[PDB]
Amino acid sequence: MYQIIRYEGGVYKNNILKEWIEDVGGFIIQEHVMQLDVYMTIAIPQNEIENFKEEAKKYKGKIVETPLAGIEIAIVSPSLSRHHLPHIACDVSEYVRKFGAKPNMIGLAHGAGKNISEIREKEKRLIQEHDIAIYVMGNFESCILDKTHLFKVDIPLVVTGGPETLDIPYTYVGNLGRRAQRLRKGEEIRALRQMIDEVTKKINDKRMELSYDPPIIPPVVLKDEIEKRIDEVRGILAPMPIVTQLDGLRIKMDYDRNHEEIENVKIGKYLLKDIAYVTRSEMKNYILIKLKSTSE
Amino acid sequence: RKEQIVDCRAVMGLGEGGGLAQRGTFAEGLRNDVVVVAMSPGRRHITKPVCEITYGIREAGIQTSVLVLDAGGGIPSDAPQGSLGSTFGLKPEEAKQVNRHKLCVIHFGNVKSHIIYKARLFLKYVDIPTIIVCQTPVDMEDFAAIGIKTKNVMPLESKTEGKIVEIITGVIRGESAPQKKIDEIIESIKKHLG
Amino acid sequence: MDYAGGNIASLLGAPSMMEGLGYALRNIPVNHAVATTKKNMMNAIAFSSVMEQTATFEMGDAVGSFERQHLLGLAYQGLNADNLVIDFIKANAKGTVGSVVETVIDRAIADGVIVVDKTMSSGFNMYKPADVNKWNAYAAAGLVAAVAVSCGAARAAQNVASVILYFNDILEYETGLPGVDYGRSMGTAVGFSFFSHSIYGGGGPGIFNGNHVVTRHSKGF
Amino acid sequence: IEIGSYVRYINTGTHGTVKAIEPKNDEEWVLLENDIYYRPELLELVE
Amino acid sequence: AYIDVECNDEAGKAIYERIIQTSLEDLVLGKSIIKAKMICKQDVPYFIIGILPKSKEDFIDRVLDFMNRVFPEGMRIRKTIRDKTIVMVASEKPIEEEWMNEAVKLQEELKIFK
Amino acid sequence: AYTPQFYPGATKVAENRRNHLNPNYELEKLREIPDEDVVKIMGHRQPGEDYKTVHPPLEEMDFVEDYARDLVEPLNGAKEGHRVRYIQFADSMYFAPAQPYDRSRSYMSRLRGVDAGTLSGRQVVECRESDLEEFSKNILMDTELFDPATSGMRGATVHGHSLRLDENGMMFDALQRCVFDEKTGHVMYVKDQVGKPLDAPVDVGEPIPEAKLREITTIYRNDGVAMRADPDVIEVVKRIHRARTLGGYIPTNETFKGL
Amino acid sequence: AIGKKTYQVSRVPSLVGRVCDGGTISRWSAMQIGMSFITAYKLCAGEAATADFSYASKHADVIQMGNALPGRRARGPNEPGGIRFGILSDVVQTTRVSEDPVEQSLEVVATGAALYDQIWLGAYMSGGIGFTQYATASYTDDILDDFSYYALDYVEKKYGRMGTKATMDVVEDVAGEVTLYALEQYDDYPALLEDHFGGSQRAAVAAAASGIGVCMATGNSNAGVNGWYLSQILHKEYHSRLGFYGYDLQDQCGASNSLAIRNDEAAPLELRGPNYPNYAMNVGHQGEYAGIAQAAHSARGDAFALNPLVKVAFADPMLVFDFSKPRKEIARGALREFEAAGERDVILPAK
Amino acid sequence: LYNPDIGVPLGQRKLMPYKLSNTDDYCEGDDLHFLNNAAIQQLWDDIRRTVIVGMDTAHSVLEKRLGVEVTPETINEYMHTINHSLPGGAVVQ
Amino acid sequence: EKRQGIPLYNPDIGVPLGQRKLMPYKLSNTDDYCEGDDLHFLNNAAIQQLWDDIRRTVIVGMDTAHSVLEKRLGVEVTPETINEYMHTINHSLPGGAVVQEHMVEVHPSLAWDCYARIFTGDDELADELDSRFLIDINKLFPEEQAETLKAAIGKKTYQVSRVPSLVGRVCDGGTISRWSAMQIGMSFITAYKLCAGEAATADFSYASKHADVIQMGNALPGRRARGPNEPGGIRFGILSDVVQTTRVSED
Amino acid sequence: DAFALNPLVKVAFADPMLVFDFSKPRKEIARGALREFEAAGERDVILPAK
Ligand code: F43
Ligand code: F43
Ligand SMILES: C[C@H](OP(=O)(O)O)[C@H](NC(=O)/C=C\CCCCSSCCS(=O)(=O)O)C(=O)O
Incomplete structure (x- = not known):
């Protein structure tokens, strides 16, 4: 009954809109003011969707439908080193943030290597404390195929990897491997959208x-x-x-x-x-x- | 070799084909040892000079937090004859988020007169030892000329509660930092952390 | 190809260093004209106007249908034809630029130079020129008088650009009539503004001459 | 290094005269004409 | 710089080609290096990267930084040979002599590259 | 004689522009800022000290005999001989009561011996210091030409004329010369127009309500009053453009028959 | 248009134009043409016919991209101050790969901005920061695209592409309507206003759209600039602001000089350029003037604007820069994936 | 409560990437500067280095002053020669 | 690879080269040899940099600017203020924008050769100035040459602006004077906090970037039409003063 | 003589920060001939490496 969306408007007369949200029973989950625009994640009752849309268009605001703003995601990078952290993993994390979810970067202690990889029980339980886990893997078929034991949790799982098609017994999204650039090409954006679609389906x-x-x-x-x-x-x-x-x-x-x-x-x-x-x-x-x- | 978990920010980045970080945001690295302070989420500060230092600290085995300042561009209003262009400042919540770390790494720019007053205002509210990373060679005595605590050159009238512990020069904004600069930063952090 | 480090000088520059063809006579700056006339107002105005309009004759601009407008401009702006400049200055001794605009419109209505075109719904009877070149000459004389009034009030020569610009603006949006030189005077005033009021500018108004890219656009007005 | 001597800074070359020596936190510090403390290992004696 | 990757993975070839290009651009090394050939053996984890430089120690440090940027995380046991052609083998296991022989083969085939 | 109209149009924006252009229209005052407070925000001179001079008084200096030059009465600041100072204003596009070209036209129609300059996000008037302070207090600051929220006396860094207002309805300021005091509901200038801090903050008054700002503004806006609702101004602009075109083509009476 | 005549396109190396100036190029091509003529036909190595070849290749039959600017401008040929608007319209090859006249005009707008405002005004006659945001405002978002498409729709609904003859009334109607629409869109959308924060950007975009619409109505370039100037002076009364002081010099004398017949003032907009006396100081006009000049011929569906030889020469697939899609090429260069010529890495030590 | 050490954030829109019209590419503002953009430099370079010469008076000089016939075979030989000579190759001397 | 089959270099056509011995070339007073192709200016980066350094040099005097700042603008000019201005122009000359992060700037590694230097015949101003960006006449010249040059220059201060080489590569030689003048004006109105909208700023702009500008070459007229700072405009004495062999040699 | 025509040009080109040092013009042309001269104006940081 409580639809959660994101409002992008200005700080001018934003307090009046917050008062309207409080009057209709809505709750402001997240607020952030950058310079003159405010991003507001609000949960309002479903019978006030059209009234809030009319109120937002009165202040020239924007309503963004975020399908993941009620969950938190663990993004399991193998490490926080230059190989996986400064690109792909933040691209996945920020794309997850763009649809409202709250991400957490999980850097494994021994998540690197092909046969020397291992996952601790403390890291395991930290992964199970989240709602859904996304694994950011590499770009070799045999390396990930010999690395199935990392994806051993009773949590919904989406595995991102370099090869287009993988034969693991889990949900897999291809064309997202280890890279050194910001994800900006069309195929990369399509693969990010695909991963968003799979996590949206699992969350639904x-x-x-x-x-x-x-x-x-x-x-x-x-x-x-x-x-x-x-x-x-x-x-x-x-x-x-x-x-x-x-x-x-x-x-x-x-x-x-x-x-x-x-x-x-x-x-x-x-x-x-x-x-x-x-x-x-x-x-x-x-x-x-x-x-x-x-x-x- | 241990697990490293980062509390990511709650706000999305700058559009689609832009930066991943957002201004006025803090990302906690659970265990608070080193905080890396970035002036802005723009391309001059994010991922070219800051996230490289961040992964070097994370590769050294030290958990890292990245804080993007809300107003990091420009000079503070206590600069002589006021400020120009833009006003640099620090929020009390930003100072509280920095002050829970064992050490701070802050990335500054080019002009010598800008960096000294920026560091003075930053250390007016930050009481942990910080490392200044800039491009042009500033000596670790010109900060003491305006009343900044400093490991080697103390002032008579100290106007800051934080101490500049190391000056590292040769890191250009918006450019890839070499491995040698990362090694100097890691050695300084290890020598001044434990 | 110039006389740079020498000790020989002339009022005219090198003919290969002109902004356009026929621009040789627009090389005398304002300060040279003022110093030649011993800081006399009307004589310096007459000198500058004579050189500028003789140059427009040299450029071929004042040929055919433009000759009457340039002759009227010379007579009424530089030589004080029908005592217009002196009359406007005397009428606006305590006045402002807008009062000069009002006196110019009143004189042009009284002399029959301009007539009412039509009255709009919200009042504002539009004005059209019964004599286009004579209206241009009247506006040029009023422009000189407005500059004299404002710069005699301030006793400073930094106001020239604003006075010309907003004299033309106020006159145009007061009457619906074209300004001096049909906007070329206003454009040259914008040029004077950015040339004498900024770090992008250079020098003061005393070095203004028509052989410069900033100040060449108005044909002696 | 004592009061009245002429000292210089190796890093920049700031000329000054020693005002006083004020130990603090079991460490030696040298106070100069510009009211700035310095370190003796970073100072050298010139004549 | 000429970039080619020898690997049996179709996606991994293109991705590591882009990785080598990005690491050459980031260190500003694309004009000072003639050829950059990487051999990817992932069934047995060992990777070889060969660099043919154009014509000081700072350049060698930059090249070593380039190898550190391109080589994967788990391949930590590394050994390099430099005789004006810099070739390094990285593996999670101790380096075998056959891998070093392939490194010298890559070095010799990069020496005559013109 | 000739009764001067000032601006065409029937809307409230055209009426406000006519009122600004009219020197016989008394602008409604909305605040009281003292003379020394205006001097302090201006930042040119210390209040209570004498004006700095650039030349001797006009009686002391000897000029040549000029009949036409002596017809015009000089300003008092020109008579004593004072330096020429400036006061600069930024005006928001969101219903600020005064606008840059409107400001320049009204200044050149109402004040003697002024130097008006118009930019997109800037407007500056230069005059002798005493006269400049006089019309800065009497016209520029205390009347309906000024709103402490949507307008601001600022030099140096100017930016925010086209940006949206903040949470208090004020124009964006990169240097933050004026802040909002919620305890009194008033805007206080904590810095002068160039940026150095003031020792005592000066109350310039409270922001004008938006309903009054709709009535007193001189800008055309789609959310306010648009030019499509004022066809008389567009017709005058088109007539001016056509007259300029016909004069530039051939400036004769027969070519102006098609006006 | 060309006729039964043969032409040669000489493209000297970019390194030559980087070490030297633009006046080097025609002389380089002339010596190499003469050398190849005397050694391909087995002639004497130096005779009177060789001087005939040199005179032909140096002037008689040469076509320069830009004229020399001696005197005050003090510049040589093949400089961006000598390139006329029709020549730059013929440089862009969107006409032969697309049938949309608005797109053909807007690629010329982007090319003219990136040349005139960014290079010729950004560095040749200024320095440092230059005018990046002044010029990118014409080709970054689809603000100018939306305005120009509205102009085309409004023209086609009541006039047609060539349905009216260029008169004063159609210029006033089209330019006023497009200016009112563009300023209403600036008022309605704060994102559009904050993108074009400077007034000069807004004024240039709205006036470019108005001039493009007048050109799509009449097909006359001079009517297009007349619509541009009407749009500028209507913007000035809408918002009570136009730009930085110094911007509207040419906009004030424009209406008079747009259809003038005097020597210093008359020139067709295809023959106008940065050395036109009104246009020789200010940013925010020249690149959009080139687009208006292109839009005059895009309404007619013309194959070229001023020079057919330039159009054919820049249709060459061996050029490093693709002139069919200038905005895509600029985007490629902004993302470090454009391979440029004129570099010297084979003669430099390894860093 | 007024703290002058808070600072004023500036340029939020100018940090967001710039789209390019009729494309799908987003880029930073710093990469659209002509000095930082190799494509704009090459765009001016290609226009600057282009010279068009009509080879019709030269053929007439060859035909009627020197008595040398001009055939498409000779034109092809000339093109082969000038593609070697224009970069800076040596043909005599 | 690049040309897709179009011929570029054909040694078979044209003259049969190498019929005689292609001799190497020594370089005088140096013990090294090279081929003649290495001495071609397109193949020699040192000759290109020789012209680049001359083209990108503009010498501007700062004595009328300081006098206008002290008297007309009412701003004190100290050696500390000159050091602040030198820092500002050194940041701003290559591509920099002072305290404006929103402004588009040139990449700093793209302009590593750009410097702003100062020299003066006034000795006490010279030792009171920072040695980071000072051309010291006393330590770069012999004593008699330094005395002669200080006597010829006087007690005046001059700044040397080295515009980055890439600016001269993309643009022409007349670009350099405009670039240096614009950046000098911006750095002067930034380091000294002055209003940029009054006529006094226009007078200061003339005094700072149009009063004592020394250009390397003059513009050329007629059929040799070129801007300033082009090698046809360089006089023989100016080029003799460019070469510094009197500093290090007595022969 | 210390200079020939302009003392200011003589002092300006004595700057050690110049990439081409004009003290030994013959020696640096030798260095550029042997491909050991590091020139300026190269756009290596805005160009692809492939
Ligand atoms: C900061 C200044 C100081 C000055 O002398 N000129 C400036 C700055 C100058 C410098 C910026 C570099 C620096 O270090 O200063 C340069 C590059 C000058 C040049 N060589 O073209 C520039 N401006 Ni300005 N300038 C611009 C603009 C603008 C707009 C900004 C509008 C706003 O309200 O924010 C306004 C003009 C106007 O009012 O219409 C403006 C003003 C101003 N501009 C005033 C404002 C403060 C003053 O009163 O002193 N610029 C713009 O409108 C966008 C294009 C932009 C130009 C650079 C680019 O194209 O990338 C830049 C162009
Ligand atoms: C065809 C010309 C007519 C002309 O305008 N230039 C030529 C050729 C031209 C071409 C050579 C093209 C190529 O490499 O095939 C260029 C490079 C000019 C150019 N930019 O194209 C040149 N000469 Ni010439 N040219 C030169 C010279 C010379 C000397 C050669 C002396 C001798 O042995 O006879 C003679 C002049 C003479 O009459 O004495 C000479 C002539 C000639 N020179 C005669 C006839 C050549 C012939 O052998 O058939 N050059 C030299 O004296 C050395 C420098 C040399 C220049 C290139 C360099 O510096 O490397 C070159 C300079
Ligand atoms: C480029 C032009 O010459 P040209 O067009 O003939 O080449 C050149 N123009 C200038 O020098 C002058 C002023 C340009 C500066 C405008 C930059 S716009 S940003 C701040 C402007 S403002 O805030 O003060 O209004 C000249 O010398 O006339």
């Missing part, structure tokens, strides 16, 4: 699976309630202080100093600890929230 299937048995509370309004109650959320220096996952949240505080405050949050008439799995995150000792469904 997982959304339908979650919609078979809905949770007690949606993650967006749970994030809104946490920002309303917890007053230390405005002091977080992280990029996204609360990351809206597909069926939960990732609050970027210390787990040891804040889990008793997070669990004892009354939403509606329920306590959070009885309705969510507040657990320690592998990412910088953060707080990870996993929502229960209405069955329990």
